[PDB]
Design a protein around this ligand. Structure first.
Ligand SMILES: CCCCCC(=O)Oc1ccc([N+](=O)[O-])cc1
Ligand SMILES: CCCCCC(=O)O
Ligand SMILES: CCCCCC(=O)O
Length: 309
């Protein structure tokens, strides 16, 4: 009997009533479409912003599509948020996380660049990482197409995108971009392997992200368990940038986030650890269906402003 907020519980009960096919039982196109539909019905609508523009940058496999969000038509030099969507490196796109990006841009009053990175199984590991790194370096170079100057970058993302957040910060730590990572925000990230964790067993079914979906994503992406680009708990934490780790108490991969924040403390790094109580994985994108999750996102926003000082 873990604690569940009443509005969270109602949402889980509706998912249980729906009782759909698993991701593995659907076609890939169907699995991706179902995620579009979930966030479409569950998340708050997009904020209005002065700037919402599609861009691209060069990557190792070809052009990488991007989307720029800014509440301001004109802005001086400052940090730029570089966002990587969740979806297991298999599903999601610029639209599944669009509304959340408009919210981050509105509430932070900073520009946000979302990355449409290549997906598995068509593009296995490390394709997503290659694209997130390349796009982040590109933003960090203050290209003219961006129309903003970056004094620093702020990698952020949910779930797989939280994995990408940490990996990108490690890659740029080892080989700097034109400006530093001034803050990273991995939100319910995969950092250590969740297999064998107590959270994975406790929350394997009925908490939005299932063990079955985790296995489906793992089989498609094919990350090597010994590769720090796949499991960034294995990386060097001694110069990690300022970090905010946000987890959910009902998340099967909660303990992976716990592990990462513990490793940052162990290495003497500054970190805010926030474990949202009574909500699940994906809480950043269900803010209409579960209204209390808007408050959880606002807590991350407040921690970001504090850590940016
Ligand atoms: C349709 C159920 C939600 C699954 C998609 C999602 O919520 O984003 C995730 C991305 C990556 C991982 N993972 O690394 O296991 C888990 C979840
Ligand atoms: C192991 C899953 C239940 C949560 C107990 C804890 O907070 O560590
Ligand atoms: C149950 C595990 C206790 C803490 C392990 C550590 O300090 O890395």
């Amino acid at each position: 009997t873990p604690f569940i907020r009443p509005d969270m519980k109602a949402f889980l009960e509706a998912i249980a009533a729906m009782a759909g096919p698993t991701l593995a039982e659907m076609t890939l196109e169907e699995a991706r479409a179902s995620y579009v539909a979930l966030h479409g019905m569950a998340d708050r609508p997009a904020r209005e912003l002065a700037v919402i523009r599609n861009l691209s940058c060069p990557g190792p496999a070809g052009d990488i599509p991007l989307r720029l969000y800014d509440a301001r038509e004109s802005r001086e030099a400052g940090p730029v948020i570089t966002f990587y969507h969740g979806g297991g490196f298999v599903i999601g796109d610029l639209d599944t996380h669009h509304n959340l990006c408009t919210e981050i841009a509105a509430l932070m009053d900073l520009p946000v660049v979302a990355v449409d990175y290549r997906l598995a199984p068509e593009h296995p590991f490390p394709a997503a990482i290659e694209d997130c790194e390349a796009a982040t370096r590109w933003v960090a170079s203050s290209p003219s197409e961006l129309g903003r100057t970056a004094s620093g970058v702020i990698p952020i993302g949910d779930s797989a995108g939280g994995n990408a957040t940490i990996v990108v910060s490690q890659l740029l730590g080892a080989k700097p971009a034109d400006v530093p990572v001034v803050l990273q925000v991995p939100i319910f990230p995969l950092a250590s392997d969740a297999v064998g964790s107590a959270s994975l067993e406790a929350f394997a079914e009925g908490f939005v992200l299932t063990k079955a979906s985790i296995e489906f994503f793992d089989t498609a992406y094919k990350a090597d368990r010994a590769d720090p680009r796949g499991f960034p708990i294995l990386g060097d934490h001694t110069a990690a940038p300022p970090t905010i780790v946000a987890t959910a108490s009902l998340d099967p991969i909660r303990d992976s986030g716990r592990d990462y924040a513990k490793a940052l403390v162990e290495a003497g790094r500054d970190v805010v650890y926030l474990e949202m109580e009574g909500v699940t994985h994906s809480f950043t994108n269900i803010r209409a269906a579960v209204p209390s999750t808007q408050g959880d996102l606002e807590r991350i926003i407040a921690a970001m402003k504090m850590m940016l000082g």
